[PDB]
């Protein structure tokens, strides 16, 4: 039974993990007979967004407490993740990826990544285990790995430019396909960077999870 | 495309809509070539639960603002739902169904259902449009319709008895099947009342969505 670590960043596209992407990732893992082992950093969200209006709210929420809603409570602090107990790592998207897992949303090419996440992904890569990042999550890759990688965030020219400025080789990719850095076993897919509906998002995520499991 | 109204009650199993059930419902609607039209009542949730610990929190949240998370902002107040603009209605589960869409959680067989939801369900049924309820959501049916209905919440002995006490014909049903009251076009399935994992929940939910869509066609 393969164990796939799934890293969340809250519960909702604007301040945490993209709910559809996280649930579709869990569905693909389950359908394939693998076990999803979910984590999230135990810290306060950088903000709380009203998803009906798009505006910031005057309240505070904890990343892990909120991410527990997506997993029905089956989640642990990211501090408890151990690369030796996992076969693959997948990071769904959502703005939380650029706000809580890193500060890419505010720093761009000068951002930094959550230290527990960075250490975990580096340990996974040193053991030859596959990583899967989607939507805006791939933007952290050039800050986790100090070596070039072929990746994709879809087709957005400005975002693509920022990734190239960070040293990555951006590869344009439609919503129903993936980009793989074969030598480093890193799989990326655009998901909601381009998906026009949930079925579209699911086609790319299903392909990403499948490739990650094969690599595992 | 058929317009399928999806009613949400918050964002999370313990104090709103079951997130996997709501997303799997949207996935099946979208994959089947139909259009999801989402709503939630604009009112404060009865409670806020820390899903890591299961403990009640000392904060308050709005059902609609939280349900907007599941729908990427694509949702309206339940007051704006118009039966004439919809072809079918589906209510995902989660404890929010028993707390925000009704007070089944605290009143059981003496509960009442959100007035807007009841009215919208009655209007759809009067027009011969199908309804789909899953998990604990079918517990509201005896309080929406004043005639016996064939439905299921799975196999829970206690809950089944409460439904029979409310006048329903409770039909034991596994996670991968559905129960349909054919004369009234009502489709129910257990989802997380029994699912052990998300693939199991998806199996029953896809069957319910497919039957609702056939009934709407």
What span, in angstroms and rounded, lies between the C-alpha atoms of A24 and A2? 18
Tokens describing residue A115: 């230290």
What tokens does B206 get?
């896809």
Resolution of the coordinates, Å: 1.6
In chain A, residues with a C-beta closer than 8 Å to the C-beta of B24 are: 23, 27
User: Do B11 and A13 count as a contact with CB atoms less than 8 A apart?
Assistant: no
Answer yes or no: B135 catalytic: yes
Strands, E assignment, B94-200: 131-134, 150-151, 169-170, 179-181, 186-189
Q: Give the minimum alpha-carbon distance from A187 to chain B in angstroms, rounded to a whole number.
A: 23
SS3 content of chain B, % helix, strand, coil (to 5): 40, 20, 45
Radius of gyration of chain B measured on its C-alpha atoms: 15
Tell me the CA distances in angstroms from A130 to A184, A188, A213, one per residue in order: 8, 11, 8
Sign of the Cα torsion B127, B130, B133, B139 reads positive
- Tokens standing for residue B15: 């104090």
SS3 B170: strand
Q: Cα angle at B118 between B116 and B121, to 5 degrees?
A: 105
Phi/psi class of residue B54: alpha, beta or left (left: φ > 0; alpha: ψ in -120 to 50)? left
Nearest to B138 by CA among B200, B194, B190: B190
Where b means 16+ CB within 10 Å and e means fewer, B119-130 reads: ebbebbbeeebb
Those residues with Cβ within 8 angstroms of residue B210's Cβ, 6 or more apart along the chain or in another chain? B28, B32
Q: Which of A11, A38, A111, A135 is catalytic?
A: A135
Q: Is B28 on the interface with A (CB under 8 A)?
A: no
Q: Which residue of B has its CA nearest to A28?
A: B199
**Could you give the 3-state DSSP secondary structure of residue A111?**
coil
Contacts of B182 (CB under 8 A, 6+ apart): none
Nearest alpha carbon to residue B86 among B116, B123, B119: B123
Q: In sequence order, what are the residues at sequence separation of 6 or more whose Cβ sits closer than 8 angstroms to the Cβ of residue A115? A: none
Q: Are A7 and A84 in contact (CB under 8 A)?
A: no
Phi, psi (degrees; rounded to nearest 5) at A6:
-120, 120
For residue A44, the SS3 value is: strand
Give me the count of residues in chain A.
216
What is the rounded distance in angstroms from the CA atom of residue A199 to the CA atom of residue A59? 33
Environment class of B62 (CB within 10 Å of its CB; exposed 0-12, middle 13-18, buried 19+): middle
Cα B60 to Cα B22: distance, rounded to the nearest angstrom: 22
d(CA B34, CA B136): 25
- Residue of chain B whose Cα is closest to the Cα of A50: B65
- Residue A176 burial (CB count, 10 A): 17
Our measurement of the distance from residue A199's CA atom to the centroid of its chain's CA atoms, rounded to an integer in Å, reads 19
Termini Cα distance of chain A: 11
Whether the CB-CB separation of B160 and B180 falls below 8 Å is answered with no
Which residues, in sequence order, are bridge partners of residue B6? Answer: B38, B90
Max CA pair span of chain B: 46
Return contacts of B54-61, CB within 8 angstroms, 24+ apart: B54/A73, B54/B14, B59/A59, B61/B10, B61/B15
Distance of alpha carbon A16 from alpha carbon A46, whole angstroms:
10
Domains, chain B, in order of start with CATH, read 2-217 (3.40.50.880)
For residue B73, what are the contacts with CB-CB under 8 A and spacing of at least 6?
A51, A52, A54
Closest alpha carbon to B13 in B60, B70, B77: B70
Cβ-in-10-Å burial (0-12, 13-18, 19+) of A33 comes to exposed
């Amino acid at each position: 039974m393969k164990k796939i670590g799934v890293i969340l960043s809250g519960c909702g596209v604007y301040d945490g993990s993209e709910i559809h992407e996280a649930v579709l990732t869990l569905l693909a893992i389950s359908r394939s007979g693998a076990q999803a082992v979910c984590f999230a950093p135990d810290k306060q969200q950088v903000d709380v967004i009203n998803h009906l209006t798009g505006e910031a709210m005057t309240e505070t929420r904890n990343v892990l407490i909120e991410a527990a809603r997506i997993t029905r409570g089956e989640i642990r602090p990211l501090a408890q993740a151990d690369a030796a107990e996992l076969d693959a790592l997948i990071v769904p998207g959502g703005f939380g990826a650029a706000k809580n897992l890193s500060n890419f949303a505010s720093l761009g090419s000068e951002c930094t990544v959550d230290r527990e996440l960075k250490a975990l992904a580096q340990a996974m890569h040193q053991a030859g285990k596959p990583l899967g990042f989607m939507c805006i999550a791939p933007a952290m890759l050039p800050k986790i790995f100090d070596f070039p990688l072929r990746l994709t965030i879809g087709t957005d020219i400005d975002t693509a430019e920022v990734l190239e400025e960070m040293g990555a080789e951006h590869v344009p990719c439609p919503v129903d396909d993936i980009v793989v850095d074969e030598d480093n076993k890193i799989v990326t897919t655009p998901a909601y960077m381009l998906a026009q509906n949930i079925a579209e998002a699911a086609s790319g995520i299903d392909k990403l999870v499948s490739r990650v499991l094969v690599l595992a």
